């Protein structure tokens, strides 16, 4: 039997199978406690639990696709949707440090230590995987993954104990203490292997193709319009007909989508109580851009997220500025004009999406509370689904010697750490590209850069990512 | 070309610390046995006498 490190995407006219492999490292915990919290806010505080476990977060898109493979994805296909996912934990080498006392560290190898692996197929434990935090994976396959520690927030009971105003969320009857050691635990010793084998639900595709037409300009530019438009107001209408030059008063049969607090340049847009509780709903809905290119510069929005760096790394949503969205887009009403910045849902509407890019998420989670709309596509990129890919928790073990009969001899957790290899494969159901009788060469697919500093390549940790994000809508539909 | 890296086994950590050398130190010895066959032709004829 052959032991392999697998990596690489294989394309077809149908789905592409993209696998990657990293080296993980379950470090250590000198205390295997649970370590509740002590936040004690003073102005609704938080209340958590710090589990001694390690989950892994392969959420982003820049791990399954190389930049050459992402460029081959954009210039050849016109949709993408995942349908399968397997996570194999390869060769495990749990080892122990012997503390040379004069050298400090000497690492032998342990055959009796193990690595407790739990897969949460039943969704019993809280899901913290898809929120966009700075522990995902290395972008390049040569660096070592350090998987994050598992922790979660619960709901408790806010008290007010202190001197001035000190609040503290204590435990209530609704609060929960999920001990992960009440489960089934593939114990997974040295050399052991384990798999997950998830299967994605039917999700709508992401349509990696722009438009060569405005949605409000879909008419014959000649010929006028069969209908009329008012001239006088005040009870005596006196409607007139239209010519072909009436472009700003052409009647549309479909409205644009909502623009709830789209502005340009804290908390952004925010719900909450009077002025100071005020939790943020930062990257808007998915129907809104937060960065595009107007006639002179880049407009950058209040509701933007930076994706790195600062100056920021924002995706250029040029396909939302086209179809009647954008940042400083007011709506006007002739009520006895009222400039409004919020646009409502407007029963017949189309708002296409905020575009996915090379570094976006893949799923988040739709929360278990009911009556969702629309929630098929989450913000921060990705899909977002009921029953997401389950979390793979990885503790090592507390091997706890020696004793000597009465004594607390030694360290009693001796010291152990585990290295390994995680090979994650995911298949994406690709759709065929939309037809164009176009005759023009379509624009080329290359990541954006400015001058001299090229995109993904080593320079004199070396490897540098571009200033703008590499979006995915660069071929035209033609609507 | 037959490329041969070893691996970057990268311990220990201790939970937060950058303990040790983190590439610990490793080296690999081995044996490469390379066989090659050469299609030989027969020697050209000479009625030479020398």
């Amino acid at each position: 039997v052959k032991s392999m490190w697998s990596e690489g995407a294989t394309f077809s006219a149908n789905s592409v199978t993209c696998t990657f492999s990293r080296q993980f490292l379950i470090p250590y915990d000198p205390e295997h406690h649970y370590k509740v919290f002590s936040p004690a806010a003073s102005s609704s505080p938080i209340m958590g639990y710090s589990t001694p476990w390690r989950y892994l977060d392969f959420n982003a898109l820049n791990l399954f696709f190389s930049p050459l493979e992402f460029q081959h994805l954009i210039e050849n296909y016109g949709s993408i949707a995942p349908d399968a996912l397997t996570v194999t934990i390869s060769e495990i080498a749990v080892k122990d440090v012997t503390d040379k006392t004069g050298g400090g560290v000497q690492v032998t190898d342990s055959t009796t230590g193990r690595l407790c692996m739990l897969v949460d197929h039943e969704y019993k434990y809280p899901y913290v995987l898809g929120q966009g935090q700075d522990t995902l994976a290395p972008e390049l396959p040569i660096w070592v993954y350090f998987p994050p520690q598992y922790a979660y927030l619960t709901v408790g009971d806010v008290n007010t104990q202190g001197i001035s105003g000190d609040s503290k969320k204590l435990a209530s009857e609704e609060s929960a203490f999920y001990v992960l050691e009440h489960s089934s635990f593939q114990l997974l010793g040295t050399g052991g292997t384990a798999t997950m084998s998830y299967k994605f639900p039917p999700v709508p595709p992401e349509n990696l193709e722009g438009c060569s037409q405005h949605f409000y300009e879909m008419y014959n530019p000649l010929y006028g319009s069969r209908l009329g438009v008012p001239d006088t107001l005040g009870g005596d209408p006196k409607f007139r007909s239209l010519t072909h030059e009436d472009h700003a008063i052409q009647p549309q049969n479909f409205m644009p989508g909502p623009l709830v607090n789209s502005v340009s340049t804290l908390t952004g847009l925010s719900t909450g109580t009077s002025q100071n509780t005020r939790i943020s709903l930062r990257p808007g809905p998915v129907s809104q851009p937060y960065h595009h290119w107007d006639t002179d510069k880049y407009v950058t929005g209040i509701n933007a997220i930076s994706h790195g760096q600062g100056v920021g790394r924002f995706p250029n949503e040029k396909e939302q500025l086209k179809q009647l969205q954008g940042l400083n887009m007011h709506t006007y009403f002739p009520n006895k004009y009222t400039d409004q910045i919020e646009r409502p849902l407007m029963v017949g509407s189309v708002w296409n999406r905020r575009a996915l890019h090379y570094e976006s998420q893949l799923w988040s989670k739709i929360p278990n509370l009911d009556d969702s709309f629309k929630t098929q596509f989450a913000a921060l990129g990705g899909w977002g689904l009921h029953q997401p890919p389950p979390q793979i928790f990885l503790k090592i073990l507390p091997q706890s010697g020696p004793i000597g009969g009465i004594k607390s001899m030694g360290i009693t957790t001796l010291v152990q750490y585990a290295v390994g290899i995680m090979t994650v494969t995911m298949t994406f159901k690709l759709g065929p590209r939309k037809a164009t009788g176009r005759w023009n060469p379509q624009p080329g697919v290359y990541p954006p850069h400015a001058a001299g500093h090229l995109p993904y390549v080593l320079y004199d940790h070396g490897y540098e990512k571009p200033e703008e994000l590499w979006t995915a809508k660069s071929r035209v539909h033609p609507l | 070309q037959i490329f041969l890296k070893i691996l970057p086994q990268s311990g220990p950590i201790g939970g937060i610390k950058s303990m040790g050398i983190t590439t610990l130190v490793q080296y690999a010895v081995g044996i490469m046995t390379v066989t090659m066959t050469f299609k030989l032709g027969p020697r050209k004829a000479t009625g030479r006498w020398n």
Partner: antibody, heavy 121, light 102 residues
Framework: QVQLQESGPGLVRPSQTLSLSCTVSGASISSGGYYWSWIRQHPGKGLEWIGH????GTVYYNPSLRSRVSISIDNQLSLKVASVTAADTAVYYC??????????????????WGHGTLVTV | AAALTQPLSVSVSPGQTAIFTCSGD??????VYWFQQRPGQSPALLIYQDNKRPSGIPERFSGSNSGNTATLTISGTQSTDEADYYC????????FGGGTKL
């Protein structure tokens, strides 16, 4: 450069609210991740830590001085230690720590300190 | 740990070293920070993360953290290092040490 200047009221013995303040110069305090500590030092003895506060209201306290002191932020970094029947006057420093990444162990230490005020009790 | 141990004072001459002890339970898997407090002045961050020094601190200060102790070694002590040195860790709140009076 970032400097921290204190404010001392003087001396009040018969159990009044000891109020302090620490205006930060060089950089604003609601500009990112930095704790803002209050640290004591008894003359002839080691340092003592009261508590630190983030700009979004969350404040950690010392478990020994928990029900006496109160840290607050109105771009002022106040401290309202009451019940001064125990005559602790020592010294009151301000200090800033960069907020760590993993929340487990402290990745940074108190690099910018204050000048220190001498309260008497 | 939650209670750092540190002796009272040390005695040194110019031309040698003075190594202090900051004892503590499981201090090897922790960060220890050293603070230089000259008399009449606020402390300054001397050695952070058990080995590193900032730009304002000269290159004669170095420390270590192994096992249940963390030392601070001064290489070539001058006539201006007579200052209280405190070790400080983070046992989930903050833990300050006693101080070796030099």
């Amino acid at each position: 450069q970032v400097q921290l200047q204190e404010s001392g009221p003087g001396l009040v013995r018969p159990s009044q609210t000891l109020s302090l303040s620490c205006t930060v110069s060089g950089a604003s305090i609601s500009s990112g991740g930095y704790y803002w500590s209050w640290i004591r030092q008894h003359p002839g003895k080691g340092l003592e830590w009261i508590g630190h506060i983030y700009y979004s209201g969350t404040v950690y306290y010392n478990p020994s001085l928990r029900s006496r002191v109160s840290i607050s932020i109105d771009n002022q970094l106040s401290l309202k230690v009451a019940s001064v029947t125990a005559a602790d006057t020592a010294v009151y420093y301000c200090a800033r720590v960069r907020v760590d990444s993993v929340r487990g162990a402290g990745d940074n230490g108190f690099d910018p300190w204050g000048h220190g005020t001498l309260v008497t009790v | 740990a939650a209670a750092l141990t540190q002796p009272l004072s040390v005695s040194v001459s110019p031309g040698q070293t003075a190594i202090f002890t900051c004892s503590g339970d499981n201090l090897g898997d922790k960060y220890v920070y050293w603070f230089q407090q000259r008399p009449g002045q606020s402390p300054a961050l001397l050695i952070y993360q058990d080995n590193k020094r900032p730009s304002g601190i000269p290159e004669r200060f170095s420390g270590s953290n192994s096992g249940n102790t963390a030392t601070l070694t001064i290489s070539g002590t001058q006539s201006t290092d007579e200052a209280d040195y405190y070790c400080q860790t983070w046992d989930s709140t903050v833990v300050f040490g006693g101080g070796t009076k030099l």
